[PDB]
């Protein structure tokens, strides 16, 4: 399986792709980004190889429900265009912790939230993406997982040396993924035959010595073709699904620095909205092109993807957890002709490079403006950039060192790992941002202490899970999309209360920083020609109405797809 | 209830939702 791509013709495609990417990057190197590149880059930053691998694996093991996550992004993307980005533009902010500094004041909350978003990036993004790329390389090539990570990040470092490049990335990835989807669906015999054959993927080897595994452990779920699964016994329960995934997605899109940073570089508000719409329409695809291909991989490679014997799973992937995360790679490697196999390897690398370069740049911005600038108040621009570069290097090192914990991570389902860790560490951030933008009363001490409590609970559960890998069901037995809701509610209530206890932060410090005061001019007094254009969110009535209708139609399409897939 | 019945019903209810949202936006 690993020797398939060794053909010279197949690798010709990857070298052509890399030459094209280098040419585009050099041309770009050698605020008017516009709607189609804004949306293309948002999609390419959101959809990395982490999504490919995790979504396909969770689709193989659990079914279509995981794909629904991506569709929720659609709705949240709409929010990002019409609720949060206008405020980030009016506030004239570059980073989100800088927005919280302007909103609340004081240095502790900015530093803390920057560090928390950096830890979130490290674990979820900079481990899942590199791990997924390593899976792709290891299944495609004999190189080990760690060596695969090393090669992948070397290639990414070459790649960085953005929105236009990410537009190329997303176009190539979308075309290649559509090609693979069509090819695999025809091979299985269409969607009807795919559904019929999917409820038969039971591996032949199901007993190890005298121990027989439970029937529900290895057979595909009866609800594998339903997004809304049982609230209690079904993995990814529908109430947890909707609410917890909406909270997590709110964090990721409307408060993470990467998405908002790429959304801010728009020429004007209309192109912000257009980029949001294009990214949403592109995000409507990742189900049909990542989840269903993984299910097809299960159908065609049941013994490899549905393994339940620890010995067999270990021999197939070196892990005794189930080999669930290698769904998409196998499909790409074993079912793709030489040229198309090379093209799909290029697609996976394209999505990964977009996501990882976006995250590297955003983390550099966060550490550069929100911590290093504060430690060295008189830092020169050159030293500032040097600090950012060293920070991304340290971030990469920490993420690589953290990879091994991601391997098992809830039975090898990488996307489950991503969503669980980010559910532990994101709901506090989402709560503070929602309250800050929508609630004037919140103040710096209250927000800081609410965040500290939320992080305390999240780290408590995370350490318990990592220690137990018999864990008490009263704490860890609840699915993490429900721990996300619990943590969000706890942080929300804590922030509200302790803010009502301490200080109002008068009212003249919240002009153009809160939703109620987004339009007031009133000579804002900060807690800490060109600018008039930068803080301008005016849009021509024609384009504004066109983009409003476009967003309504996009969310209509998202709801239609959700209901079509139950 | 075929899947496209569900899709159309969801489109209808969500369109009503957006219509109510814009109605309140105009009124509020
Ligand atoms: O970590 C949360 C994020 O995970 C990504 O994989 C999904 O595409 C996003 O919708 C979500 F917000």
Residue numbers in the entry:
A (entry chain A): 19 to 48, 63 to 193, 200 to 507, 516 to 574, 627 to 664
B (entry chain B): 27 to 54
Publication passage describing the model:
We adopted the “three-joint-tethering” strategy to generate the fully functional hSGLT1GFP-MAP17nb protein for structural studies. It was reported that replacing the equatorial hydroxyl group at the 4-position of glucose with a fluorine atom yielded a glucose analogue, 4-deoxy-4-fluoro-d-glucose (4D4FDG), with an enhanced affinity for SGLT1 (K0.5 is 0.07 mM) compared with glucose (K0.5 is 0.5 mM). Therefore, to obtain the structure of hSGLT1 in the substrate-bound state, we supplemented the hSGLT1GFP-MAP17nb protein with 4D4FDG throughout the purification, the nanodisc reconstitution, and the cryo-EM sample preparation. Single particle analysis yielded a reconstruction of the hSGLT1-4D4FDG complex at 3.26 Å resolution. A ligand density was found at the sugar-binding pocket of hSGLT1. The surface representation of the hSGLT1-4D4FDG complex shows the substrate-binding site is occluded to both the extracellular and intracellular solvent. 4D4FDG is caged inside a cavity surrounded by TM1, TM2, TM3, TM6, TM7, and TM10. Above the sugar-binding site, I98 and F101 on TM2, M283 on TM6, and F453 and Q457 on TM10 block the substrate entry pathway from the extracellular solution. Below the sugar-binding site, N78 on TM1, Y290 and W291 on TM6 form the first layer of insulation. S77 on TM1, V296 on TM6, and S396 on TM8 form the second layer of insulation. In the extracellular vestibule, F453 moves 3.8 Å inwardly due to the rotation of TM10a and forms hydrophobic interactions with I98 and F101 on TM2 to close the extracellular gate.
